[PDB]
Amino acid sequence: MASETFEFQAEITQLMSLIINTVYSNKEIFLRELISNASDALDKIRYKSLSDPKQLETEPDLFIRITPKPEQKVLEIRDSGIGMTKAELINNLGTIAAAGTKAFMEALSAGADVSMIGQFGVGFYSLFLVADRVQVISKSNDDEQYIWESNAGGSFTVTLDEVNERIGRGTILRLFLKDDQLEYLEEKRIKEVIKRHSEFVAYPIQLVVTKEVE
Template identity: 55%
Template sequence: MEKEILGDGDDAKLEILIKLDKEKKILSIRDRGIGMTKEDLIKNLGKITKSGTSAFVEKMKTGGDLNLIGQLGVGFYSVYLVAGYIEVISRHDDDKQYVWESKVDGSFATSEDEWNQPLGCETEIRLSLGDEAGEYVNIEVPADEDESTEEETSESTSEEKDGKKKPKTKTMKEKTYEWEVLNDVKAIWLHSSNEVTNEEYAKFYRSLAKDFREEKPLSWSHFTAEGDMEFKARIFVPPKAPRDSYENY
């Protein structure tokens, strides 16, 4: 990808931003990358109306096997399990900014975006969470703060003081967001084994295994295979066997 397309400064960072508006019950996920054109949005997201996925999602809501979602290649449409209305806002360097909107009934519409904040080469997904997804409204994502600022109003009324008229002011609340990095673990797969410390291996293992007991893996191996097929691998041996290892393995 050409660096000029990504922009400068913070706009050039490849990252995923997650924001939650608890009052409006809207979960927003923004991915900085290459974005999508109008054709991409219709071709890749509009297939739900002709693929039978809408019926599949309804089946999932009534107690189907949720593990099948990823296996059948309809992972994106799992959003309908928690949201009744979805917006996908995206801009590609070769096109204007567009909004793809859809409801749980499978209908969708695509239009040029003239009202949202202009994006770089990005895609933002907004989920309007339903009442049954209340548990997601209480999750802790980036910390948000309320800042109070004073602004002069354009009201015709004013206060008399010392023979002079002074315009009234009112306090306005403006919400700002402070982004918190959640995956601060070093990407060890991008480095050779002699560039990664034992502590970095242990930290990566705990992040991968969701093990927060500060225990280090019993052992690990980091290697690269080359030949007809090339791949990199990291193998970790947990410090303890899983509790259900005899029942499930």
């Protein structure tokens, strides 16, 4: 319940500020980036399990799941991958990405397409193309479930999770969509973005759709 507050390394702050404010036209690339991250996390729990099969037991099903939450203007991207500990959330989302953000920012200033962001290993931050706030909710086998929260400002919070559904293992990216990016809540649009940029994914991609019965 009591949150802890941390400062972003200056370079990450710089990268986020640029992305949340950019008028780049191909914002849909965020979904490919987050699906790729989900796939990586799943690769890692699968590989870890080769020599430690009990690691799968916390969530035997390996999947990527996409859930639009229209009333809240939220889009969730979930995986049952390896997940992240508290220390991992703090270090990797707040500091380790710093250098990668610098080289990528230099490439941007030179004319690189924002879509290159994954090749510089900082594609997580592409979520700010469509969202002005994010909660990363994560459960590693090695720690409790935690919430990392950022609004692209210079600081982020980490809080022990006593408010969200239990995930057996893995991560939820909960995107709070900008008012002009609500198209990414629609089933039709989501399918077309997946089919276009994520053709070769080794894991099931599940879409959770809410429909009124008549």
